[PDB]
Structures are given as C-alpha cells and as structure tokens.
Amino acid sequence: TTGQMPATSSLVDLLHHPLRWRITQLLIGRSLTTRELAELLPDVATTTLYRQVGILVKAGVLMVTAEHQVRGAVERTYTLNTQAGDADHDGVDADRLRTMFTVFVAGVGGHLDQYLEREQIDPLADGIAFRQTALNLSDEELAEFLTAFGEFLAPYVAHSPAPDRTRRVLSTILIPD
Amino acid sequence: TTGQMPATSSLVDLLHHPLRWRITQLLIGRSLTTRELAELLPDVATTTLYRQVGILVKAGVLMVTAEHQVRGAVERTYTLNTQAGDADHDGVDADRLRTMFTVFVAGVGGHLDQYLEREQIDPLADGIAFRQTALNLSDEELAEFLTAFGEFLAPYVAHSPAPDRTRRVLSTILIPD
Structure with a gap:
C-alpha cells in the first residue's frame, strides 16, 4: 500500500537510521508483531530490534493495530502510521x-x-x-x-x-x- | 516511454558523467536536435553539449532518428537507443x-x-x-x-x-x- 516519504522533520530525522528504515519498510501494507519483525531481521540483535520498534511507535511512525494475550503476556501488532507520513x-x-x-x-x-x-x-x-x-x-x-x-x-x-x-x-x- | 537503466558496462560507465545522464534523461520518450537540447541546458557551454551528444551517439546510447538540411547545413535529430538499454x-x-x-x-x-x-x-x-x-x-x-x-x-x-x-x-x- 502506497506510503509517501514522511515530511515531518522529526520522522525524517529518525529514518536516517538504517535499522529504523528497514523496520518501517517491512511494515508497508501489513501488520506484524515485534516477534515477527525480529524473525525477518535475523542479523539484528533481538533486544535492539525491540528497542527500535519502541522508538518508532513512541514517535508515531508506527501505530498499534492489536494487542492480545500470548503465553500469559501481552503482544502488540504494529503497522505504518500512514497518517503520519501524510502530514x-x-x-x-x-x-x-x-x-x-x-x-x-x-x-x-x-x-x-x-x-x-x-x-x-x-x-x-x-x-x-x-x-x-x-x-x-x-x-x-x-x-x-x-x-x-x-x-x-x-x-x-x-x-x-x-x-x-x-x-x-x-x-x-x-x-x- | 519506459527505458531500463542500461546494463552494458560501457554504457553504464558513460552515465556516471552528470551531463551525459542529463542528456539521456531529457531524451526519454522523444527526439530532439542538438540545438534543442542546447536550449534545454542553458548552463552548459554549447560546444560541450555538442561534444557529449557526439560521445553518446558514437557509443550507441543515442540513435539518429532524422537528418535534413537546415540553413544550408545538415541537422540530426536524436533519441534514446532503447535497444541498447535492453542488452x-x-x-x-x-x-x-x-x-x-x-x-x-x-x-x-x-x-x-x-x-x-x-x-x-x-x-x-x-x-x-x-x-x-x-x-x-x-x-x-x-x-x-x-x-x-x-x-x-x-x-x-x-x-x-x-x-x-x-x-x-x-x-x-x-x-x-
């Protein structure tokens, strides 16, 4: 699904980071758990992957599309905040x-x-x-x-x-x- | 009209040069005389523009689509050799x-x-x-x-x-x- 390169300076600045770019590009047109993202980025240390998703979510580059209980603990699903790349x-x-x-x-x-x-x-x-x-x-x-x-x-x-x-x-x- | 980035090493090497890239991109989907190209590239010295068209033509990046007599002298029209970018x-x-x-x-x-x-x-x-x-x-x-x-x-x-x-x-x- 068609996203535009964000124009907001804060989002643009975050996307200089090559792992943050990799994560947001993997999320174009679909939603994934952090566990799923981790599995698609085997070369990245797991803790680091979770950290950068956290950063992106907090900045509003990503949005939470679901959360449910998986093995006693809560798991969020994420996708691109396409609304953010349109501002x-x-x-x-x-x-x-x-x-x-x-x-x-x-x-x-x-x-x-x-x-x-x-x-x-x-x-x-x-x-x-x-x-x-x-x-x-x-x-x-x-x-x-x-x-x-x-x-x-x-x-x-x-x-x-x-x-x-x-x-x-x-x-x-x-x-x- | 849709051209692909040439793959032939000789053409690829020529397109590193920023003026040669400018010329071939201006010729996508249409044909122009060197005089017309010159007028679209006012910042480029006229002799230099003609030189680089010559280089591109000889290398087979461009092809001659017409030539006729204009003011006593012969004038060629050029376009992209799309056949060359497909090899x-x-x-x-x-x-x-x-x-x-x-x-x-x-x-x-x-x-x-x-x-x-x-x-x-x-x-x-x-x-x-x-x-x-x-x-x-x-x-x-x-x-x-x-x-x-x-x-x-x-x-x-x-x-x-x-x-x-x-x-x-x-x-x-x-x-x-």
Missing part, C-alpha cells in the same frame, strides 16, 4: 526536500544491499528493475494520474502472502523538468 | 548491479537538484513525490504486473507537449525482500 507536506523547503530524498534513496540502497547478500542472484529472474518514463502532464492531469495509478495498483496490493509469492517493494520518484 | 541484463553480477543503482540514483538526484534551482518551489503543488508500495507477487505474476503497468502508462505517455503541461520524469525501482 506537513506543504511547508517543505529545499533543505527538507533534499534530506527526504537522501534518506529515501539510502533506505532503498540498503534494501538492495540486503538482496545482494543472497547466496545466489539473478537480477533479471529476481525481478530487480530500475526504470524511467517521461510524461507530459498538467498539474491537474498529474492529480488524476496519481489517483488512477493507485487504482491500477489496487488489485495487486490485494494479494495475500503465499508459498509462490515474494514480497516486492516498488519505489517511485516523480520530479518535473 | 546484457542476464550476466549482471553484484558489482555491476550496485554500480547501475548508484549511477541511477545519482542521475535522479541531479534532476532533483535542478528542480531546486527554481526561484520559487512548492514541492507539493509541483508534483514531487517519493512513494513506496509493497506487493506480494510470484515471479510470473510480476511479469504480468510489469506488462499491465506499461499498459496503464500508455495513454499518459501518449500526451503531446502543450502550454498547460509540464514534462515529468517517473523513476521506478523494484526490489524483492
């Missing part, structure tokens, strides 16, 4: 926008680095793609394009996990000449 | 893939820097967006998704330039967990 996008000046981009591409770069830790790679077979398309659009046509793009994505975003499926992250950057 | 994508190893990414995000970053040279910016009103979506897709579903994505884009890619329209560059990166 403060108007007072964005040059400096803030540069920082947002830098943090965004560093996160994506870190995801690529993780892919390259695979014992065997075939970028083509594995579905790695870096592409660009040029579009002539008025500001109003661009608003329509973005709405239609979300509608184009919707049936795919609806796919559940399954043994034949791999979770893929599609990052989009749009800049005018 | 050598199978023997891509870790080192080549990293380089491709680095060169790609540096180019996009340079395009953002150019946007930030505007006297007045409003990133939101100007249509700047950094987004991510997660999709659960089998390798075969991903091939379908990519084909449908091209079909989704087609009517917008068909838009001609006009006074109400601004050329926008949509960059896409797809990486699996």
